[PDB]
Ligand binder design. Structure first.
Ligand SMILES: OC[C@@H]1O[C@@](CO)(O[C@H]2O[C@H](CO)[C@@H](O)[C@@H](O)[C@@H]2O)[C@@H](O)[C@@H]1O
Ligand SMILES: OC[C@@H]1O[C@@](CO)(O[C@H]2O[C@H](CO)[C@@H](O)[C@@H](O)[C@@H]2O)[C@@H](O)[C@H]1O
Ligand SMILES: OC[C@@H]1O[C@@](CO)(O[C@H]2O[C@H](CO)[C@@H](O)[C@H](O)C2O)[C@@H](O)[C@H]1O
Ligand SMILES: O=S(=O)(O)C[C@@H](O)CNC1CCCCC1
Ligand SMILES: O=S(=O)(O)C[C@@H](O)CNC1CCCCC1
Ligand SMILES: O=S(=O)(O)C[C@H](O)CNC1CCCCC1
Ligand SMILES: [Zn+2]
Lengths: 316, 485
């Protein structure tokens, strides 16, 4: 049996405040006895701006019922800073939240605020937590976003060593080994190899990157992630397509495709034809480019008939 | 008109090739390919005259979807407490869905919608996900509330628009409190920075005539730095220390690509110098079109590369298509017509795959095997609207709008937070007011551009790109706040 807070001696001094819905509201939720009671007392606590242990206790009770309650999380963080609570303990509590499947974006934002405030000299333990969190859920968009923020924030403080960057690339390569179609891991690779301020972008560095990309294409020729990365890479560094063309050409009819091609690889690969088309435009061969665009439109990628026709008309 | 938009039924459905490397992605993809294609096989081709015997009819089940929305409109079970911070969205998804379905609310029910939403308005500025005495203001429910008031409200004393007009200064101040120096906004106090917040803020600020130079500083750079190597946009960008460079923080994603493209589009009507910083429009269009699924997955959209198609991306990705197309058109004109995505196949996804099975709860869904909900109902219908109609931003209409604009009419100007944060003078403010208003009302329905797959009984109303409310809602609403009635 639930004991109402209006009967508890710990809360005797507090007068609860009802939700101010106005008359006959639309989309009302049939709040449970527990949730309504807790919110009634939170309304009172927050209105008087009480910073206390019982207030902290109450916010945990509410977020456990509704992890997506952004207002209550805001108040919780204020309570943590006012009461000068252990932020390390709070982090461990967030770990317990994930184990108990109490997950939502607000939990992840809370983690960011905690780590920003703790501001540890070495964020490795949190990096590890994120990796472990990504293993059974490898495409969690905001976990990936958080990982980007963490390395980015802590790097501006000069707290990410070269060894740390190296093991991060090691970890990324393993994620891509496990699932070459994990576009989130391709994105992380782009941060690690191209976009981050400290990325090694010497001439031989670019060469090695091309080798990795092409090896990925030869492994999985229909991998849209791999093609997008290739196109994005060449564009960003303003590199000509023609020199790489021999590696791509077999997919239209430096590491080369395996002979024979892997089983279950019907030709042509649509994005391989896009490459050929764009390499013709590079050579100012607009007619030959229009011809492959037309082929994509009417034969080899008909779902995008209108788009490839548009690209064809852009030449003729 | 359908020459470059083939039907799923006229194309060959084959699985995404494995290349003899199995992975977790392909396992999920193949299973989804099976779900969608088998449903298409059970369902009569919407384009057929001879709707063959025994097969499921794909007609838009408007009454079933109306019932679905009605059943949760006046009461929700206690298990839906997870949506307590999102009740304004429940309102928006419903009232907008009903608008698209062409089902009117009586005045009494509309008045309840207005009352409910106004109690979410806090005196300090902005709407929260619940009553002001229960929740703090937040950019997203502010968008949902404002748009809902455009849909269900009016210009009388009980209409709610009056209250928004009076709230203009406080909402603007809330917006300014949300602002970060890099051009991003926090969604709420102590909250996350992302491009959805920007979108929601820019929509509201545009509609209510509260745009200032100080509000917009760096906002273009934040959005523009969200664009990834893939061509779509991430949720946010990171400023490395004014900033020496900005870096995208995640994958190109249907939702944030929509919000970014729309944000950028809204910024292009503000006549500030060297503003907004350009985006790569061609790459955004490329990414957009590439997210439309293969025939076997029903021609629906996915939200990111190598992920499953989802009904909701019909709005996020599909609704971004006309915006990307217009930006590409403008860039080509700055140097110096067939559909750009498969309009037919997208409607086919909606009718065949995204509807709840007939004779049940109704509503629209992510994909077969998923419970329908208000969110997917609204976003499926919004996307279907974009596919059904040919919406264009018309330079001649913008010109007509300029010629009819009355600068002597308007609401009091917002007082800026910083003394020099406003416009240089009254002339420049009025020119900005004109441009913002004229461009907001620039979207037209192209004559002869209509394609209604399965016949005219499937037709729903035309939604406006960028804003995602009906033109007939947008026009009198913005005209009220700019006093152009
Ligand atoms: O088998 C290769 C090819 O089939 C076509 C249709 O003629 O495409 C279909 O099959 C591929 C998978 O092999 C897909 O990607 C499907 O979307 C599809 O419609 C041609 O593209 C082609 O030469
Ligand atoms: O194509 C324009 C168009 O024709 C209408 C009938 O007036 O529908 C026909 O075309 C659609 C789309 O190609 C098919 O699904 C049909 O089976 C069909 O009858 C129509 O509603 C419209 O917008
Ligand atoms: O989070 C507690 C807290 O926030 C402050 C401002 O930092 O007030 C704000 O929080 C209250 C309570 O949720 C709301 O009324 C509101 O949005 C607000 O001004 C501060 O007073 C501190 O108590
Ligand atoms: O168009 S919807 O599918 O939304 C509505 C619908 O299914 C109702 N069908 C009834 C069945 C009994 C006889 C009269 C019609
Ligand atoms: O596209 S048209 O307007 O020419 C024809 C059209 O609307 C057909 N709708 C049918 C009518 C019978 C029940 C099922 C839906
Ligand atoms: O912000 S205002 O001054 O307009 C009114 C006011 O103080 C509201 N604060 C509530 C307190 C309870 C939790 C949610 C926020
Ligand atoms: Zn969805």
């Amino acid at each position: 049996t639930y004991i109402p807070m209006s009967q508890r001696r710990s809360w005797a001094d507090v007068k609860p405040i009802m939700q101010d819905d106005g008359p006959n509201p639309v989309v009302p939720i049939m709040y449970s006895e527990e949730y309504k009671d807790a919110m009634d007392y939170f309304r009172a606590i927050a209105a008087k701006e009480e910073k206390s242990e019982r207030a902290l206790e109450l916010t945990e009770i509410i977020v456990r019922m509704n992890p997506a309650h952004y207002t209550v999380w805001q108040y919780r963080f204020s309570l943590l800073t006012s009461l000068n609570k252990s932020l390390e303990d709070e982090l461990r509590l967030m770990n317990e939240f994930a184990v108990q499947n109490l997950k939502s974006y607000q939990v992840w934002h809370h983690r960011l605020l905690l780590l920003d405030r703790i501001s540890p000299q070495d964020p490795v333990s949190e990096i590890e937590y994120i990796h472990g969190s990504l293993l059974p859920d490898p495409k969690n968009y905001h976990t990936w976003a958080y990982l980007h923020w963490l390395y980015s924030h802590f790097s501006t403080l000069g707290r990410i060593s070269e060894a740390q960057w190296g093991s991060e690339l090691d970890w990324c390569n393993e994620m891509l080994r496990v699932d070459g179609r994990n576009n989130s891991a391709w994105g992380w690779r782009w941060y690690l190899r191209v976009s981050r301020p400290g990325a090694e972008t010497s001439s031989r560095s670019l060469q090695d990157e091309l080798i990795y990309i092409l090896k990925s294409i030869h492994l999985i020729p229909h991998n849209v992630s791999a093609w997008n990365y290739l196109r994005g890479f060449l564009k960003h560094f303003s590199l000509p397509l023609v020199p790489i063309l021999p590696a791509i050409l077999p997919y239209t009819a430096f590491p080369m495709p395996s002979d024979p091609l892997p089983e279950d690889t019907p030709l042509p690969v649509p994005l391989a034809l896009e490459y050929l088309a764009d390499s013709f435009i590079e050579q100012n061969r607009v007619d030959d480019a229009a011809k492959v665009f037309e082929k994509l439109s009417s034969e080899y990628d008909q779902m995008r008939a209108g788009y490839w026709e548009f690209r064809r008309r852009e030449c003729a | 008109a359908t020459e470059f938009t083939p039907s799923v039924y006229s194309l060959v459905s084959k699985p995404l090739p494995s290349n003899s490397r199995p992975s977790a992605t392909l396992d999920e993809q193949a299973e989804t390919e099976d779900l969608i294609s088998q449903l298409f096989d059970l369902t009569a081709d919407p384009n057929a005259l001879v709707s063959e015997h025994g097969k499921r009819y794909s007609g838009l089940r408007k009454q079933e979807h109306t019932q679905f929305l009605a059943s949760s409109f006046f009461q929700l079970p206690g298990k839906f407490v997870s949506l307590d911070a999102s009740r304004p969205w429940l309102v928006f998804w419903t009232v907008h869905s009903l608008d698209l379905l062409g089902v009117a609310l009586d005045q009494g029910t509309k008045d309840r919608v207005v009352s409910t939403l106004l109690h979410f308005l806090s005196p300090k500025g902005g709407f929260g996900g619940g009553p002001a005495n229960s929740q703090i203001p937040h950019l997203l429910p502010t968008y949902a509330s404002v748009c809902s008031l455009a849909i269900a409200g009016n210009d009388s004393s009980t209409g709610g628009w009056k209250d928004l007009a009076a709230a203009r200064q406080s909402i603007y101040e809330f917006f300014m409190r949300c602002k970060r120096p890099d051009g991003g906004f926090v969604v709420c106090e102590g909250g996350e920075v992302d491009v959805r917040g920007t979108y929601c803020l820019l929509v509201v600020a545009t509609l209510l005539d509260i745009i200032t130079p100080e509000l917009l500083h760096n906002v273009d750079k934040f959005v523009s730095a969200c664009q990834t190597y893939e061509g779509g946009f991430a949720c946010a960008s990171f400023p490395f220390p004014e900033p020496s460079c900005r870096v995208s923080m995640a994958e190109a994603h249907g939702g944030y690509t929509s919000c970014s493209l729309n944000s950028h589009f809204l910024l292009t009507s503000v006549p500030l110098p060297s503003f907004p910083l350009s985006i790569d429009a061609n790459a955004a269009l490329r990414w957009t079109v590439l997210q439309q699924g293969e025939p076997i997955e029903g021609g629906g959209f996915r939200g990111r590369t190598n992920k499953l198609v989802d009904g909701c991306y019909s709005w996020w990705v599909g609704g971004g298509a006309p915006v990307a197309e217009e930006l590409v058109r403008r860039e080509k004109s700055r140097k110096v017509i067939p559909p750009i995505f498969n309009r037919v196949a997208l409607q086919e996804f909606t009718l065949v795959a995204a509807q709840q099975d007939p004779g049940s709860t109704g509503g629209l869904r992510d994909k077969p095997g998923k419970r329908p909900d208000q969110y997917h109902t609204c976003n499926n219908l919004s996307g279907l609207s974009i596919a059904q109609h040919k919406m264009s931003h018309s330079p001649s209409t913008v010109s007509s709008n300029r010629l009819k604009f009355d600068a002597s009419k308007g609401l009091p100007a917002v007082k800026p937070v910083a003394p020099g944060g406003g416009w240089k003078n009254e002339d420049e403010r009025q020119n900005a007011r004109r441009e913002i208003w004229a461009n907001a009302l620039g979207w037209i329905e192209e004559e002869g551009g209509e394609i209604i797959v399965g016949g005219k009984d499937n037709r729903i109303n035309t939604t406006t790109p960028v804003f995602n409310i009906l033109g007939l809602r947008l026009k009198p609403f913005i005209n009220y706040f700019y006093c152009q009635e």
